[PDB]
Amino acid sequence: SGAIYVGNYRVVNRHLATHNDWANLVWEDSSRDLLVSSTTAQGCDTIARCDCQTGVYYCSSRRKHYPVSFSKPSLIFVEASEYYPARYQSHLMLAVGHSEPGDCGGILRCQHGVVGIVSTGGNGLVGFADVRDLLWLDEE
Numbered sequence: 001s002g003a004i005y006v007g008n009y010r011v012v013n014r015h016l017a018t019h020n021d022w023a024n025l026v027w028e029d030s031s032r033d034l035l036v037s038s039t040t041a042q043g044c045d046t047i048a049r050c051d052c053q054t055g056v057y058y059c060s061s062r063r064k065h066y067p068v069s070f071s072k073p074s075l076i077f078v079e080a081s082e083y084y085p086a087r088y089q090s091h092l093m094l095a096v097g098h099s100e101p102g103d104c105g106g107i108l109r110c111q112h113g114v115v116g117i118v119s120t121g122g123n124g125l126v127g128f129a130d131v132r133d134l135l136w137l138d139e140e
């Protein structure tokens with residue numbers, strides 16, 4: 001679990017969105033595993049606007065913050081699950097690092113701010129949904 005709080009937006013994995021999130025929907029994209037809902041309180045996060053390939057992410061299944069090198073956002077095939085059939089997930093970045101299904105929502109940060117959130121994983125791999133291209137999160 002986990003979410004990003006920027007201005008009056010809450011960014012969550014779409015598969016973990018609540019019914020309140022859906023009632024207050026701003027934007028969602030199933031192919032990205034993202035959903036953004038509106039908030040009443042202002043959050044304390046800043047979104048990175050950069051092409052960084054290094055950073056640190058939080059791993060709940062280890063209670064640890066790990067430094068990582070990660071790939072560029074791309075279309076990556078993700079196996080079928082209880083939330084989606086097998087498909088290409090877009091804007092995904094992979095890294096060698098520990099993850100388990102419950103780690104989704106863990107934030108990845110670089111020196112410029114929030115880069116994305118854990119969305120996928122594998123045997124010694126972790127995948128992050130990028131948020132740096134969503135320029136509108138910084139305004140309106």
Ligand SMILES: COc1ccccc1CC(=O)N1C[C@@H](C(N)=O)CC[C@@H]1C
Nearest residue numbers: 001002003056057058065105106107109
């Ligand atoms: C001190 O946190 C970090 C430091 C470096 C890099 C990453 C983090 C994680 C982070 O930003 N978290 C943990 C977070 C989560 N959902 O992963 C809950 C809220 C909070 C905003």
Ligand SMILES: COc1ccccc1CC(=O)N1C[C@@H](C(N)=O)CC[C@@H]1C
Nearest residue numbers: 033078081083099100101119120121122
């Ligand atoms: C962090 O996730 C894992 C880590 C290790 C092993 C397996 C997983 C699970 C995983 O990849 N997904 C993909 C996710 C999606 N974005 O389509 C929905 C289902 C499930 C939460």
Ligand SMILES: [Zn+2]
Nearest residue numbers: 050052110112
């Ligand atoms: Zn950066």
